[PDB]
Structure 1
Amino acid sequence: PRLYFENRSKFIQDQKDKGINPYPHKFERTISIPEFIEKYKDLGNGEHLEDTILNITGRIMRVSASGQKLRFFDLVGDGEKIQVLANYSFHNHEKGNFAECYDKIRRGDIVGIVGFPGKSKKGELSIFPKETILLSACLHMLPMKYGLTEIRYRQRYLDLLINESSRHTFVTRTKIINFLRNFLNERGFFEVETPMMNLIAGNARPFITHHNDLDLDLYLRIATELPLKMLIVGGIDKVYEIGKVFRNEGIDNTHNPEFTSCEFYWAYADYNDLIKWSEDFFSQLVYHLFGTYKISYNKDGPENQPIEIDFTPPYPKVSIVEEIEKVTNTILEQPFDSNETIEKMINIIKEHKIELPNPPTAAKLLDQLASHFIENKYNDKPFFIVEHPQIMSPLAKYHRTKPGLTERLEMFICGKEVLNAYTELNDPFKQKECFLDSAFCTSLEYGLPPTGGLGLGIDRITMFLTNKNSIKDVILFPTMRP
């Protein structure tokens, strides 16, 4: 209970009163635990190198029987575990009594060990201490290795120490990001940094904050799209950024207020080049992590059967306007925001009984029509939704053959959007929103070269590559209410 904390807290006072520093300043580690393994993992059983004295650190995760001559411990560090065999014969009695300097070590304590490598006669690789010091004691009681359950979200430090699956989840998350950064850097791109506080944000509700020195409300950025396109006008033909974006929307299993995004912009490249980029990226991404393009994902949870997602390119391409016109057997007349087609789309929303968006705009009705009849159609492999109407794509260049549409693409995994790209609209006259930042509109008048931009959802991508059902499991500290 709280009793264990009260006992360990006053033990720290005892050692302080006995002239011992329970939190010493420096302990010179001469080898880490993973490095300890590789250097001595092929030693014989019972073979001791008693004449190679190491200095090792780590956390105690298991204390064994208190045999008054042999002590067994578990030293875990950097995600890997070794054994500690404290023998009275090998212990240095010059610094303290053997039984006295080991009965005080509880499970969870950070210790510093001076010893030599070797293997047990059983066959377990162990470090044999001649000297053991407490570096940082654990006042509370650590849970068992299967005791975590939303504590993993608030006390993430416990979740990283107890559940082995949690570390792997984040060792691969930053590997997905590092692979993405190298993928663009090796193709001649340019990582930059665009501001997060502006005067207008540019489908999102804005986080409003106030600057006290300037006395003006600033919108937290919802997308790094506009300032990156302004950098394309500036000459930076291949630019990207990987940072946090903000949505003041709802919180559920696949949405978070802040979330990691990546947007690159490619000069003189178009919609066809963006499809090839995503096919090359995701295929090599999952092959870099797994040695294969087919991955297993549990859409229904770990208790149920998983599905197989094949990442072998190419991926299916599906036009949104056509399949909405097929699965519903309807014909939508352009313009889609006419008072007749708007009513016709609402009629389909009420027949098939779907949550009608609020308010009923032709863009939201088309998006809602695609979210039910198209998105959750193909789950065993990623696919693109292509050629969105310009009523749904204000900054996407008009389609070069079919009127009313654009050259847009959205890739989905298990029916969730993880990618958004299109050929960038560069005509300032065809951009009617410019009669949006007025600084962006002015930058279009200075000449935006034919550009293709693409946006990636880092958190959702990491979810499906780690077999996770909730976005709270790919973020170290998800924002919640105390």
Structure 2
Amino acid sequence: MRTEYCGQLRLSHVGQQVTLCGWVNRRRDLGSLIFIDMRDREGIVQVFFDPDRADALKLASELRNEFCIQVTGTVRARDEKNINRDMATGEIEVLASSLTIINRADVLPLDSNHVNTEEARLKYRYLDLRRPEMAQRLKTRAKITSLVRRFMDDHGFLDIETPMLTKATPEGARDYLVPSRVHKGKFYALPQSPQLFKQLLMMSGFDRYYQIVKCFRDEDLRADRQPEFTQIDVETSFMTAPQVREVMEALVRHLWLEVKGVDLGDFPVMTFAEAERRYGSDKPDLRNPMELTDVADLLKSVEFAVFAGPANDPKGRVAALRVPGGASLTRKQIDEYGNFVKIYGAKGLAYIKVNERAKGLEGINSPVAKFLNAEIIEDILDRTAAQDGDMIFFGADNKKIVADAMGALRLKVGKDLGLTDESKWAPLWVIDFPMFEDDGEGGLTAMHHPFTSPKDMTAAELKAAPENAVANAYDMVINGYEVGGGSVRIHNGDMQQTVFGILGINEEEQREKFGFLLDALKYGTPPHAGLAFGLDRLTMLLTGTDNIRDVIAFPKTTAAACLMTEAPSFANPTALAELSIQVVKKAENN
């Protein structure tokens, strides 16, 4: 039964008799003297065993790393010459008087004085979590959720739980099914989110809801993509979007002030259009000062097929990227970039070296100067406000390929030329997203989701030109990452029906899939907006880590596996027969 945690002890404790519980971190013999660096969640404290107490020193000579021990001793000032300014407890040590070895420990299969593969660490996850760097991530994660909860509470959001055993619904995405042993042949779905349930709660009278809940995406797992993730789910009533962003922008500033101790200022606000016109993504990193420019309009009448083509293509754009001091680039250099953009499906990467606008065409060097002309090149420079000693790359292709590749080359050229200040925080709000996005199969899909309200288009106009409808949707981006987002919901039935229509789902399907939703909108539905936060990303950002698996106690690999428990695995054959199901071949039956 401890009396204090090893790592909290400071000079202020000098004099007290304490009982420490924890693990042997290191051990160092200094003559007949035995020193132990004892460890527990608060940290490490040096424990001194004197030969004056024969039995404690007796047992202490068997101590090896990771032994589970208990020591009752006296805290005391280390000598000036022994102060260790790099340990929080660096000014004291505990002169032990008693020791009890609670449990010996096998040699760890996870070496510590050396680096390990995220793999070996994940198999011995329990062991890897004993590391300070690691355990501090989880402790700050606990701190953050705690700062969130107190916030929501002070602001009046009720923590209401939603079900995890859900109903598999249409569109949105892919779910994890759960067969039923009671309703043989039927399933539930792990929720992607409390999406429809929280709205149902705003219609139930609760006025402000929040929940820190688990969501499951059964789509392929990317880099920092787990099959499960945790969201700070929020829903409000009787509030506009600007109002929703306000308090939501407050919760985040509060987090950055309490945790990293930084102030962020009022978040700037950009529209989806501006964000794309200027950075090629709906989650810009404003840490990088550079920005794209459009010139297709200037290249419609050129002979050059690489420009003319995408410039006369309704779905194309030719984006210019003015990279300061870029003229200095080399051929090998310019080519990596050229190949780089290829990765994002782009062709090449035309360019212009602006050595001196004081010599017109003569002041610029370029593989494509002969294709443009004196006039067109002057406008391109003015439009880009090119500087002498500046390079101008051009991405000409399909709007999506250009945004994709040019916004990528924009970021890469940022690190290379040292133009991005990785040290800064660039938070912002991207608003005015479209309602739908082409689904590649003939129709439209909800940019955010089926229940997003259109900024100002009427049901009729929406029927008329859905592709152009703007949404009452907003995302919070911080340094190039989508931390959260949401929208003002639709509180009118004809409107909701109309969108289900554009989404290609018919009355009958609407009835059976969103029937409960379509009926509830008939009973005084209040205006309501919400927003969800990416907890994991938030924690990553706040614990200064890039490995999402570093902020999760027991994460899964990129293949959705748990190397420590070995799931997924084969289910008891019996289990399946009780569930009235069986595994088959991709080909075999049908």
Instruction: State TM-score, norm by structure 1.
Output: 0.74
Corresponding residue of 1:128: 95
2:545 counterpart of 1:468: yes
Equivalent residue for 2:495, pick from 422, 430, 433: 430
Cα RMSD after superposing both structures: 3.3
Could you tell me whether the CA contact under 8 Å between 1:210 and 1:217 is conserved in 2?
yes
Alignment of 1:59-98 (within 5 A): 59-65=23-29, 67=31, 69-89=32-52, 91-93=53-55, 98=57
2:434 counterpart of 1:389: yes
- Cα distance in structure 1, aligned partners of 2:271 and 2:429: 6
In structure 2, relative to structure 1, the CA distance for the partners of 1:130 and 1:319 (3 Å cut) is closer
Equivalent residue for 1:454, pick from 520, 523, 531: 531
Alignment of 1:196-345 (within 5 A): 196-201=164-169, 203-215=172-184, 216-293=186-263, 311-320=264-273, 323-324=276-277
Alignment of 1:374-385 (within 5 A): 381-385=426-430
Deviates more, 1:220-229 or 1:275-284: 275-284
Corresponding residue of 2:21: 57
Deviation of 1:458 after TM superposition, in Å, equals 0.7
SS of alignment partner, residue 133 of structure 2 = helix
Deviation of 1:258 after TM superposition, in Å, equals 0.4
Q: Which amino acid aligns with 2:273?
A: I
Deviation of 1:170 after TM superposition, in Å, equals 1.8
Which whole-Å deviations, capped at 9, do the CAs of 1:400-448 have from their partners, x for residues lacking one?
2696212111122232221112111111111132465432222222232
2:498 counterpart of 1:415: no
Deviation of 1:113 after TM superposition, in Å, equals 1.2
In structure 2, relative to structure 1, the CA distance for the partners of 1:125 and 1:475 (3 Å cut) is same
Equivalent residue for 1:185, pick from 153, 161, 166: 153
SS of alignment partner, residue 445 of structure 1 = coil
SS of alignment partner, residue 134 of structure 1 = strand
- Cα distance in structure 2, aligned partners of 1:455 and 1:263: 5
Which whole-Å deviations, capped at 9, do the CAs of 1:247-302 have from their partners, x for residues lacking one?
00122322111000122111110111122223322222211112222xxxxxxxxx
- Cα distance in structure 2, aligned partners of 1:369 and 1:237: 43
SS of alignment partner, residue 33 of structure 1 = coil
Deviation of 1:459 after TM superposition, in Å, equals 0.8
Corresponding residue of 2:586: none
Could you tell me whether the CA contact under 8 Å between 2:269 and 2:431 is conserved in 1?
no
2:112 counterpart of 1:144: yes
Could you tell me whether the CA contact under 8 Å between 2:11 and 2:77 is conserved in 1?
no
SS of alignment partner, residue 143 of structure 1 = coil
State, as a whole percentage, how many aligned pairs show the same letter.
22
Which whole-Å deviations, capped at 9, do the CAs of 1:357-399 have from their partners, x for residues lacking one?
xxxxxxxx99888666779879951222221222224211121
Could you tell me whether the CA contact under 8 Å between 1:188 and 1:238 is conserved in 2?
yes
In structure 2, relative to structure 1, the CA distance for the partners of 1:372 and 1:441 (3 Å cut) is farther
Could you tell me whether the CA contact under 8 Å between 1:29 and 1:56 is conserved in 2?
yes
Corresponding residue of 1:37: 10
- Cα distance in structure 2, aligned partners of 1:102 and 1:319: 65
- Cα distance in structure 2, aligned partners of 1:437 and 1:152: 45
Deviation of 1:328 after TM superposition, in Å, equals 5.7
Which whole-Å deviations, capped at 9, do the CAs of 1:219-273 have from their partners, x for residues lacking one?
1111111000001111001111111000001223221110001221111101111
In structure 2, relative to structure 1, the CA distance for the partners of 1:225 and 1:181 (3 Å cut) is same
- Cα distance in structure 1, aligned partners of 2:259 and 2:27: 36
Corresponding residue of 1:23: none
Number of matched pairs: 403
Corresponding residue of 1:303: none
Corresponding residue of 1:399: 455
Deviation of 1:148 after TM superposition, in Å, equals 4.2
Deviation of 1:200 after TM superposition, in Å, equals 2.0
Deviation of 1:125 after TM superposition, in Å, equals 1.6
2:65 counterpart of 1:107: yes
Which whole-Å deviations, capped at 9, do the CAs of 1:450-476 have from their partners, x for residues lacking one?
111111111111112222222111111
Corresponding residue of 1:478: 555
Could you tell me whether the CA contact under 8 Å between 1:420 and 1:455 is conserved in 2?
yes
Which whole-Å deviations, capped at 9, do the CAs of 1:188-240 have from their partners, x for residues lacking one?
11001101122224732111111212221111111111000001111001111
In structure 2, relative to structure 1, the CA distance for the partners of 1:468 and 1:204 (3 Å cut) is farther
Question: Structure 2: 5+ residue runs without aligned partners?
Answer: 84-90, 279-291, 298-311, 319-340, 347-397, 412-419, 437-446, 462-468, 501-509, 564-590
Could you tell me whether the CA contact under 8 Å between 1:320 and 1:374 is conserved in 2?
no
Which whole-Å deviations, capped at 9, do the CAs of 1:326-362 have from their partners, x for residues lacking one?
956689xxxxxxxxxxx9676569xx87469xxxxxx
Corresponding residue of 2:128: 159
Question: Structure 1: 5+ residue runs without aligned partners?
Answer: 1-27, 44-48, 294-310, 332-342, 357-364
- Cα distance in structure 1, aligned partners of 2:544 and 2:71: 38
- Cα distance in structure 1, aligned partners of 2:192 and 2:485: 14
Equivalent residue for 1:172, pick from 127, 137, 140: 140
In structure 2, relative to structure 1, the CA distance for the partners of 1:201 and 1:382 (3 Å cut) is farther
- Cα distance in structure 1, aligned partners of 2:475 and 2:495: 23
In structure 2, relative to structure 1, the CA distance for the partners of 1:228 and 1:463 (3 Å cut) is same
Q: Which amino acid aligns with 2:195?
A: E
SS of alignment partner, residue 442 of structure 1 = helix
SS of alignment partner, residue 44 of structure 2 = strand
Could you tell me whether the CA contact under 8 Å between 1:85 and 1:128 is conserved in 2?
yes
Corresponding residue of 1:301: none
SS of alignment partner, residue 469 of structure 1 = coil
Could you tell me whether the CA contact under 8 Å between 1:270 and 1:422 is conserved in 2?
no
